[PDB]
C-alpha cells in the first residue's frame, strides 16, 4: 500500500543522509525508470499547511477523472503527515511512494513525482539546514509551490533569493535559466476586495509585487531581477483562509465538512490549475528533459555536493554582516600599514637603521590596530578578536619582508 | 483635539527626517517637559494589526477610570490610521499628540507616550529603512511590543537580533543591558491546547523557544544569547485570531460587536497588563532615568547617527554572504601574489632586469586572478566583477612597489647598459 517515503534524512547533528535504497525502489522501477518525470514540490515556512495541501494534491492525482475528486465531505485527510501544534512535523524531504503515470495532451506518457519538504525557519534548524532542503527541492522539482502566509513580504523575496542562489552554486554552469515553474501560493489571503482569490487576482498582485522600475532602489530592483532570472514561469494564487476550526481545533482531521466553503471552492480550482495534464511540465536540467532514472542521479549528485565543503555556507544577516565588516577592516588596516611602511622603506627611500625601522614598525602596527578597533562593526568585540589576531599576524609577516628590503640597501 | 503626529519621516529617496517642531510641540510643553517618561512602542512586520492594537491602547489610556474602558460595542476604532489592504499604511514613526499623565503606586506622575511604527519588510522599503525604524523605536521606547503573526520563527529572531544590534551600534557605550522591556505579542495564535492564550501560555511558550543551551548549534545559541543580553525583561502574550470579519470584511471599522469574543477577553487582559500604572517602566538610558525633554535630545542624537554614515549598512543574507565570500577571496589571491613576488624580487633576491620582472609579474597576476575566479562564492560572477577589478588594481599597485624595490638594487642598469652598447 502506498505511503510517504523519507528520502532526504536530516540528522540531529545537522548532517544530511540520502536513503538511496528507498529512492531507487520508487524511481527505478521498470514501469517508470525510463519515463520523463514531472516533479511537484511545496516549500516555505514551517507550520503553514504544506503537507495538508499535498494530501489534497494526492486526492486529485488518484481521482483526476472524477468530478468529485476533492472527496467525501466526511473522509479524513491522509497521506503525508500533517497536524496542528507549534512544533515542526515534516523533516527533510519525503516523496509519495506511488509514481503517477499521466498522458499529456502531446500523447506523451509522463511520470509524476510528489515531494513534501521540511518547512524553513523552525526552532531546531540552522540556516544551512533550511537552505539545503529548499534548494534541493527547487533543483529537483519542475513545479515549486512556494507556500506563503497572508502576504508577500520583502524578506520572503530575500529568502527565496538566498535559497535559489544556494541551489545555483551546486549546479553545473548553464546559459539557460536554472529552474522552471514557481507558484507563489498565498495562504489566508484576506483582501479579496483588493485582489480576487485565485490565479487572476494572484497574477495582478504578483506583477505589482515583483515589478522592477527605474525609480526603484537598487536593492529592491536586484532581488526582483534575480527571481525573474531563476525561473522560466512564475505564477501566483491567492487562497482564502480555511476557517478557524482548521487552524485551531485539535480534533480536526481534514474533513471537508469542517472546511470553509470558499476555501474549498478555490482549492478545487487550485489543484487542477497546478496538476492538470496540460500544466505538467517535464523536468529539464541545463536544457535536457530528465527521466526518473536521470532524476535519481541528480538527487544523489546534488546531495553529495551539499554533504561536502566545496560551497560557502549560508549565514544569518548578522553573522554574514559581521564577517564582511571584519574582513573589510582587516584589509583596510593592513593596506594602511603597507602604504605607511612604503613611506619609510619603499624602494626609493634610504636605508633605515634596524632599531629605527623596528620603532617605526611598532608605531605603524599599533596605528593599524587602533584603526581596526575603531571601525564600527556588527558582531561585537569578541567576534572581532579572531580578526584582530589575524591582522597582527599578517602585519608581522609583512614587517619581515620589509626588514629584508631595507637590508638590501646597505650591501 | 488629539491626534497622531508624524515625528520620523521616511522620504522616497530613503532618507530620514525628524520633524523637530512637531516633536517639540508635544514633548516640551510646560505640563510634561520635566516629567519622567514612559514610552510604549509597537513594531514588527507590516500589515499585522499594529495600529489597530494601539488604538485599543488609546481607549485604555483615556478611560482607565471608567468601569468599561473597552468601549461601546457599536463604536468604531479611531486614532492612529489602520485599515485592510495589502499595501502599507503607517510610515516612519508617529506618536499620539496627547501625553498622558499617570500617577504610579509610588506617588508622582509620569508622562506616557505612545509610538506607532512603520511595519518592517514592506515592498517599498530597504532593509536599512526597516532596521532604522525598528531600532529607533526600540531605543526610544521603554516597553517595546514586538508584534508577530502566528508563531515565533527563526527568521523573526534573526531580524530582531539584526535590528537590536543596529540600535546598540548607535548608542553610548554602557556596561548595562541597552534596552528595558520587550513583549513578544503573537497574533492569531492557533494552538491554545498546547499553550493557552495570554501571558502564562506565552511565558511557557517563550521560555522554551528562547532557552539558551550550551549544546545547541552556535547559530541557534548565539541569536538567543543576543536577545537575552539586550533586554532586562522579556515576556510573551499569545492572542487569539480576531475572526474572519476583522481580517477580511472591508466594511469592518473596528466595532467590538464584530470582533470574536475570545479575542476581546484576551485584549482586555493584554492592555492593562501592558499599561497599568504599576507596570509602566520609566525610560532609562545609560543608567539615567529620562524626562520628556531628555527624550527629545536622544531622539535628535540617535537620528543624527542614522542620518550620517558612521555605521555599517544592514544587508540581506545574500548580499552580506556574497560580500564576505568575495572579500576573503580577494585577500587570499592578493596574499598569494605577494608571496610569489617575494620569491623572485624579495629584498634578499638579486636584481631582475625590467623585462624579466614584468614577465614574471604578469604570470603571477594571472595566477592570482585565476585563483580568485576559482573560489566558489555566493552572488554570481557578475557580483564578483567589482572585486575582481579591485584585486587586479591592488595587485598593480603592489607591482609598482616591487618595481621600485628592484630598481634600488641596481640604479645604474640602464646607464651602464647604454654605455656598454657603444
Ligand atoms: N491558517 C491556516 N492553517 C492551515 C491551512 N491549511 C492547513 N492549515 C493547518 O495548518 C496546520 C499545520 O499543517 P501542516 O500541513 O502539517 O503544515 P506544514 O508544516 O507546513 O506541512 C494544521 O493545523 C492544518 O490544519 C491554511 O490555509 N491556513
Ligand atoms: N488576522 C488578524 N488581523 C488583524 C488583527 N488585528 C487587526 N487585524 C487586521 O489587520 C489589518 C491591518 O491593520 P493595521 O493596524 O493597519 O496593521 P499595521 O500595518 O501593522 O499597523 C486590518 O484589516 C485589521 O482589521 C489580528 O490580530 N489578526
Ligand atoms: F512545520 Al512542517 F512540514 F513545515 F511540519
Ligand atoms: F503595514 Al503597517 F503600519 F505595518 F500599515
Ligand atoms: Mg509538513
Ligand atoms: Mg500601522
UniProtKB/Swiss-Prot annotation, chain A:
Its EC number is 3.6.5.-. GDP binds at residues 47-52, 118, 187-188, 246, 249. GO terms for molecular function: GTP binding; GTPase activity; GTPase-dependent fusogenic activity; identical protein binding. Mg(2+) binds at residue 51. Changing residue 325 to K: In HSN1D; the mutant protein has decreased GTPase activity compared to wild-type and causes disruption of endoplasmic reticulum network morphology. Keywords: Acetylation, Cell projection, Coiled coil, Disease variant, Endoplasmic reticulum, Golgi apparatus, GTP-binding, Hereditary spastic paraplegia, Hydrolase, Magnesium, Membrane, Neurodegeneration, Neuropathy, Nucleotide-binding, Phosphoprotein, Transmembrane, Transmembrane helix. Residues 317-408 are annotated as: 3HB (three-helix bundle) domain. Disulfide bonds: none annotated. GO terms for cellular component: axon; endoplasmic reticulum; endoplasmic reticulum membrane; endoplasmic reticulum tubular network; endoplasmic reticulum tubular network membrane; Golgi apparatus; Golgi cis cisterna membrane; Golgi membrane. Changing residue 131 to P: In SPG3; changed endoplasmic reticulum tubular network organization; endoplasmic reticulum and Golgi morphology are affected. It catalyses: GTP + H2O = GDP + phosphate + H(+). GTP binds at residues 47-52, 187-188, 246. It is found in: Endoplasmic reticulum membrane; Golgi apparatus membrane; Cell projection, Axon. The modification N6-acetyllysine is found at residue 365. Expressed predominantly in the adult and fetal central nervous system. Measurable expression in all tissues examined, although expression in adult brain is at least 50-fold higher than in other tissues. Detected predominantly in pyramidal neurons in the cerebral cortex and the hippocampus of the brain. Expressed in upper and lower motor neurons (at protein level). Changing residue 187 to Q: In SPG3; loss of GTP-binding; loss of homodimerization; loss of GTPase-dependent fusogenic activity; changed endoplasmic reticulum tubular network membrane organization. It is linked to Spastic paraplegia 3, autosomal dominant: A form of spastic paraplegia, a neurodegenerative disorder characterized by a slow, gradual, progressive weakness and spasticity of the lower limbs. Rate of progression and the severity of symptoms are quite variable. Initial symptoms may include difficulty with balance, weakness and stiffness in the legs, muscle spasms, and dragging the toes when walking. In some forms of the disorder, bladder symptoms (such as incontinence) may appear, or the weakness and stiffness may spread to other parts of the body. Belongs to the TRAFAC class dynamin-like GTPase superfamily. GB1/RHD3 GTPase family. GB1 subfamily. This is Atlastin-1. It comes from Homo sapiens (Human).
